[PDB]
Write an enzyme that holds these catalytic residues in place. Structure first.
Site, PDB file in Angstrom:
ATOM      1  N   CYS A  49      26.776  42.092  38.515  1.00  0.00           N
ATOM      2  CA  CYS A  49      26.475  40.942  39.365  1.00  0.00           C
ATOM      3  C   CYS A  49      25.203  41.151  40.179  1.00  0.00           C
ATOM      4  O   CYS A  49      24.370  40.242  40.276  1.00  0.00           O
ATOM      5  CB  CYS A  49      27.654  40.643  40.291  1.00  0.00           C
ATOM      6  N   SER A  66      29.336  37.475  36.179  1.00  0.00           N
ATOM      7  CA  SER A  66      30.675  37.792  36.641  1.00  0.00           C
ATOM      8  C   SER A  66      31.573  38.082  35.452  1.00  0.00           C
ATOM      9  O   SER A  66      31.244  37.781  34.302  1.00  0.00           O
ATOM     10  CB  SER A  66      31.273  36.651  37.476  1.00  0.00           C
ATOM     11  N   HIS A 116      31.638  40.779  45.333  1.00  0.00           N
ATOM     12  CA  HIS A 116      30.929  40.028  44.311  1.00  0.00           C
ATOM     13  C   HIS A 116      29.725  39.374  44.972  1.00  0.00           C
ATOM     14  O   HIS A 116      29.714  39.144  46.182  1.00  0.00           O
ATOM     15  CB  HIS A 116      31.848  38.980  43.663  1.00  0.00           C
TER      16      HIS A 116
END
Lengths: 234, 22, 5
Positions: A100, A152, A135
């Site tokens: 990510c 992702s 994330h």
């Protein structure tokens, strides 16, 4: 780079059920599928920015998510922008799987040619079953609308076309996506707009706003994202 | 170019491994 | 940031 190389294979021996036989079969194979090198997307000036973004996200997908357990492009978040853009260029030349954070750097490198497009990092801290999860995606604004680029493990935690009319709607979409897999959203870190100068000597400001989603409450969370959106027109 | 035939094989192996790990 | 979910 043989030390790094055997680290990756030694690490696979641990994590995969059948770790050693897997390395054996691939490292000993004389014929392997040659992977075509992805072409870096370049755009005519007539191409609308939304179609450019679809092409940038497709390129990022083409590199594939890095499941190997070894990151090939380490990113010191304190590096100046010109340092991170050098690294994005080498991702372009090495063309290996990514995660990510690397995709955020790639997204900036590939959208510096779009001055009417605003880019800004959005990172999430979520909770699930006693574990914390981090994330990050690249928020984008075009013509008053919000979207996201990213990489992702889940399809609904990366690409959003720039259609949301406010930043709140964009962030709440991510929370809903987190909720569908039973993750609670604990904290949102939003950065400032990233300069389009690939030679800029400044760092990305990853933490212009840090929002405690549980300590804020619904409407105060919305007012907080809107203050941040107003502050990106600074 | 001794570097490049080696990077290509490493890359082919990385994507072979990446595929297995999915 | 290493989970990416």
């Amino acid at each position: 780079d043989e030390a790094t190389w055997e680290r990756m294979w030694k690490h696979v021996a641990k994590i995969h059920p059948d770790g050693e036989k897997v390395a054996q079969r691939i490292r000993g194979a004389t014929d392997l599928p040659k992977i075509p090198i992805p072409s870096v997307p370049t755009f005519q000036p007539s191409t609308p920015v939304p179609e450019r973004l679809e092409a940038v996200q497709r390129y990022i997908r083409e590199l594939q998510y890095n499941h190997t357990g070894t990151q090939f492009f380490e990113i010191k978040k304190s590096r100046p922008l010109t340092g991170l853009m050098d690294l994005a260029k080498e991702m372009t030349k090495e063309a290996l799987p990514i995660k990510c954070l690397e995709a955020v750097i790639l997204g900036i490198y590939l959208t510096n040619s779009m001055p009417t497009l605003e880019r800004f990092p959005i990172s999430f801290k979520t909770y699930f079953s006693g574990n914390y999860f981090r994330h990050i995606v690249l928020g984008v604004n075009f013509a008053g609308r919000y979207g996201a680029l990213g990489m992702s493990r889940r399809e609904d935690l990366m690409y959003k076309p720039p259609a949301f009319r406010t930043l709140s709607e964009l962030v709440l979409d991510f929370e809903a996506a987190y909720g569908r897999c039973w993750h609670v959203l604990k904290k949102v870190k939003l950065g400032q707009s990233v300069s389009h100068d690939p030679h800029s000597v400044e760092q990305i400001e990853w933490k212009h706003s840090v929002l405690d989603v549980e300590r804020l409450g619904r409407d105060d969370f919305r007012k907080e994202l809107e203050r941040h959106a107003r502050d990106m027109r600074l | 170019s001794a570097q490049q035939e080696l990077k290509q094989r490493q890359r082919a192996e990385i994507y072979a491994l990446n595929r297995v790990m999915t | 940031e290493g989970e990416c979910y």
